[model samples]
Target: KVFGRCELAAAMKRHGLDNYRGYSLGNWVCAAKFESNFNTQATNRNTDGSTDYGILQINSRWWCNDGRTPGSRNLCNIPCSALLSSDITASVNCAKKIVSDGNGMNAWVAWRNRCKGTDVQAWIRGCRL
Candidate 1:
């Protein structure tokens, strides 16, 4: 699965986050790489026993399951398609939410750790980078 940089950039730009610093994009790309191994059709075991789906690896159970509170959307849902369709806005916003929120981006901090050497702040700075 080829993770297109241009597409990812576009998504970030759409979210009013045009900062393409070494750390920001690097972190995102790194996360994407880790999440799906750059594969758009990434899937995983969601907390609710449903599945997370897509490139951004959006939770299918969380996004589309109707069985539970978070089950309204299942199988990652189509709107999430933007995440895997080179929608840079979707990509950045999604990652941003998870990075800040934690729950969405399960490994945000860990992925962020990869961007820094000793000073984790450097990676945070990459947020604006």
Candidate 2:
């Protein structure tokens, strides 16, 4: 399912992503907006032959196993298919795991380049956050 901007913001916060690892709620929302446009089923393959899955676009190479990527670490211990769902619990947990890996939100290109250091509220202006 595709989520509205406000819907995604609220959902991600309720999932405890707000201010996680020093990444604000707005950064989470904005990352989702750019990565997958808040679409739970979004998927994209990288040049390295790994696929990024779901809303936050968790990668198959190191995070989730897609049975397609070569030498997958499957660090999250969850299937890549699990990341694409209306219930975002798995995705959120994997995202947190990525943050805990010490790279912060740098794991995500959208979050690293687009959301980093931008005004927090600018990403969530109309959400009444």
Q: Could you report the Cα RMSD, in angstroms, for every candidate shown?
A: 6.2, 1.1
Q: What is the per-residue lDDT of model 2 for residues 8-115, given as tens digits with 9 covering 90 to 100?
A: 887888889977877788888889888898888898889889999898999998999888777999989999888877778899999989888977888888988888
Question: Which candidate wins on TM-score?
Answer: 2
Clashes of 1: 15
Instruction: Tell me the deviation in Å of residue 24 in model 2.
Output: 0.4
Model 1: per-residue Cα lDDT over 1-129, one tens digit each: 454555544444456444333334445555555566666656576566655444556654444332433545333234555655543445455545544543433444335444333432332343433
Range of the 10 consecutive residues with the lowest summed lDDT in candidate 1: 115-124
lDDT per prediction? Answer: 0.48, 0.86
Which sections of candidate 1 miss by over 4 Å? 4-23, 61-78, 102-129
Identify the candidate with maximal lDDT: 2
Give the C-alpha lDDT of model 1.
0.48
TM-scores for candidates 1 onward, in order = 0.49, 0.94
